Symmetry: C3
Subunit: 200 residues, 3 copies
């Protein structure tokens, strides 16, 4: 209704304890990576954030990950490090960051979370130092653009990465400090809400 979460979910899972010679290659795989985790899920950005958050709890890395709703192949040395990694992705997936509705009619959904310590997945899919804070904002395009601008007019932050909307949602990440990351966040959600009630 208001800002009620949207529990995302895990739809499939499977570990490949020892990726083929020929697969690791075509796949373009560091030598050190012979184990593999396949995770899929519904929300992309909420998985993106998991992939990230499991790059900190197991020595793993996101070999891959795009919107289908998703797929994230987590790479690691032995399986036991990609397990803990997957088992974490789930955990940050089944109960962590979540979209939210922006109207009551439940038909215009947004996403304002703060990543306080980027693991290696977004530090990198966004010109950043590993760990720097971040504001991951996802909303419908138009609802999106207007909200960033606001975002920005709200805190000393910068666009930390930005090809625009053309997810069928605009997403964007803003760094700066981390409180400022938060206000910006707040202000993103208000923007997007004034429009979902009355702009749109």
């Amino acid at each position: 209704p208001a800002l009620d979460l949207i529990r995302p979910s895990v739809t499939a899972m499977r570990v490949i304890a020892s990726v083929n010679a020929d697969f690791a290659r075509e796949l373009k795989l560091p030598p050190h990576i012979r184990s593999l985790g396949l995770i899929s899920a519904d929300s992309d950005d909420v998985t993106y954030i998991a992939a990230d958050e499991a790059t900190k709890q197991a020595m793993v890395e996101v070999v891959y990950g795009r919107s289908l709703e998703v797929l994230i192949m987590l790479g690691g040395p032995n399986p036991a490090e990609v397990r803990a990694g997957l088992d974490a992705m789930i955990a940050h997936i089944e109960n962590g960051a979540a979209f939210q509705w922006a109207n009551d009619a439940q038909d215009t959904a947004f996403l304002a979370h703060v990543v306080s310590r980027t693991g290696s997945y977004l530090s990198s899919t966004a010109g950043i130092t590993l760990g720097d804070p971040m504001a991951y904002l996802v909303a419908p395009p138009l609802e999106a653009t207007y909200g960033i601008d606001a975002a920005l007019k709200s805190a000393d932050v910068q666009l930390a990465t930005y090809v625009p909307p053309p997810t069928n949602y605009s997403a964007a990440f803003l760094t700066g400090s981390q409180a400022a990351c938060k206000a910006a966040c707040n202000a993103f959600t208000d923007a997007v809400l004034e429009i979902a009630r009355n702009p749109i």
Copy 2:
């Protein structure tokens, strides 16, 4: 009765997460191998084929394996790679290659499977390139010899390894292509069946 499978089974299992200094030695163990998998089973050849098939799914290798009905000690770096290995052996053991009866009286049992991509266990217990196809034929001695010959007179194949029968069954492996590996296979089973009905 006819060619009804003979489900083999797993009788025991145990991982040794960290083999003794002194055991690894007497055992003649590569340094890289400190974990160990003990598997036992009934059918030998069907385990042999598992040992093989788990050498492809976990970075493991068959440190050992002979007919007792069996024992296969799988070697690996950490345990988590010998687990996935054992868990696979089982899987290819509880539901994969299987002996079959050759008479109806259920008392003369054979084994004709095709290993399309040898892992490192048989490529090696048979002058071969790693992965080359293969025809693993097991049958009572006499039923055995007559059937190979046939085997051979059936497809362009070669004996890829062969000390003869003297398992209480003759076994033998034939390489060549892989279709030819199959006909040879077919022709092995017919041979062995004409005798189990009427030669024997």
Copy 3:
């Protein structure tokens, strides 16, 4: 009553598959150690002996461990080696070495076990060769001192480590042979029992 065991127990557990950069450091952690096991328990000495006994079953080592009743952080390369390690600590904890009562009134408790092959935890918290036998004697202070002396007057053994009592119990370790380790052990328990009935 007499010498009835005192089952110790495991109160908490948790694996940290990938210890922080900054934690491993402050913690003073070999590079090779990125996985971590936290175990806690009631009896200290009985955990001490586990920590030890799991240093032999998984490639792990006791990064830490003191009396609180306890905490033992087990260090290892991947998690799969610290798991097997923890799972062993438990096993030698839930069913192995155990305190015992020394009176019937159940209020003066002792501990006489023989560690026949020290792993790396005590070989080292006691000038010893890795594996040398050992006699780990824990008893109330006074009950303690009198009993060692006896200990010693009983077998050719040596104090293998000794800051005295000031556990709220004196503990001490005696090496020598391993039978002699045992008599010494026996004689420690009698001593401590003559006093728990009548000295004390």
